[PDB]
């Protein structure tokens, strides 16, 4: 709830954006599972933000990536299958 | 939920599984289990999930997991 | 905080159960003996439950390590008693399961009876317990669940039942006891041989030892 997030998609990938402003890259811990995304962001003054949804579709962890930018964090999930996800999170 | 570590081993508590799993490895058809509940009624023993009801208790114990879902650490 | 609220609670049966009871009590049936099978089934079911629970927690059996069913006729009081060491019932279980909630099979069983079905089907419609009123004018149930204290439920099927904390009775340990007060023309169910044949007729292959006393 500390930061909001959005996604868009292409036939072969889902791009998740977390709108978190001035975050140093070392404070960003992101990991990928077969069908889960893990995003944990440390905030020295406060509690850590986390976004860890089970995903609508399966992904390929080895091909996933992210970039920590000045204004946001962009995460690219490689779809395991060529289908349109009806949402980001499983069962939604 | 509270924060988790997708690399941390857990014990699945789904009926008929009880396996150790990581979650980084979890997915929607990973776990074979009876969602349950068990049913003991009018002298029949069985599982409401697959609707199989059997007669002997020991026989009931052998009814195979009927569903593929997510492993669940709780 | 009212530090003494353990009285006797009185409850009205649900309308549909009052109807069921009246149907059971006011019509003639030639096979009333099926009541015993229904009570044995309920005991068997309750023993299954605590057995199952015990597979993942052996301490579940502590208050009574043996799984059994005892049948005790008494000519002096005209009562037929059935005792089991099943899972027993919480006070809430008594109120919820034995009078205050009309389960879906209730109205269904009544319709099935009016269409021509035999009263023997009562177990399949989720209301087998009330078949005790085929032969008894009064039933008292004492019961002990691991989670609660011992309670006694009682009814003469006159529209209501009571539930009372039982601090003075024998003390079951775990399980339930049903005492049936037989009607005048139903004394045959106190005879050892009648019970024996009946257990053999309708039960016979139950998975827990039944003894007669
Ligand atoms: N001997 C017993 N021990 C524990 N619970 C019982 C016993 N007899 C009856 N009950 C409870 O009362 C409920 C109603 O019993 P019954 O009218 O025979 O319907 P059913 O067995 O189809 O549920 C049971 O489901 C059970 O929860
Ligand atoms: Mg029954
Ligand atoms: Zn099943
Ligand atoms: Zn599992």
Author numbering:
A (entry chain C): 150 to 241
B (entry chain E): 148 to 221
C (entry chain A): -2 to 210
Give verbatim lines from the article:
Functionally, CHORD domains are associated with CS domains, either within the same protein, as in the mammalian melusin and Chp1, or in separate but interacting proteins, as in the plant Rar1 and Sgt1. We have now determined the crystal structure of a ternary complex between the nucleotide binding N domain of Hsp90, the CS domain of Sgt1, and a CHORD domain of Rar1, providing a framework for understanding the architecture of Hsp90-Sgt1-CHORD protein complexes in plants and mammals.
The N-terminal domain of barley (Hordeum vulgare) Hsp90, the CS domain of cress (Arabidopsis thaliana) Sgt1a, and the CHORDII domain of cress Rar1, were expressed, purified, and cocrystallized in the presence of ADP (see Experimental Procedures). The overall architecture of the Hsp90-N-Sgt1-CS-Rar1-CHORDII (H-S-R) complex is a puckered heterohexameric ring with approximate diad symmetry, and with the subunits in a cyclic a, b, c, a, b, c arrangement, so that each protein contacts only one copy of each of the other proteins. As expected (Heise et al., 2007; Shirasu et al., 1999), Rar1-CHORD is a metallo-protein domain with two structural Zn2+ ions. Rar1 interacts with Hsp90 via the C-terminal lobe of the CHORD structure, at the opposite end to the Sgt1-interacting region. The core of the interface involves the interaction of Hsp90:Phe49 and Leu52 with a hydrophobic patch formed by the side chains of Rar1:Ala185, Phe187, Trp194, Phe204, Phe207, and Met208, augmented by polar and solvent bridged interactions involving Hsp90:Ser38, Ser41, Asp42, Asp45, Lys46, Arg48, and Ser200, and Rar1:Arg190, Arg192, Glu203, and Asp205.
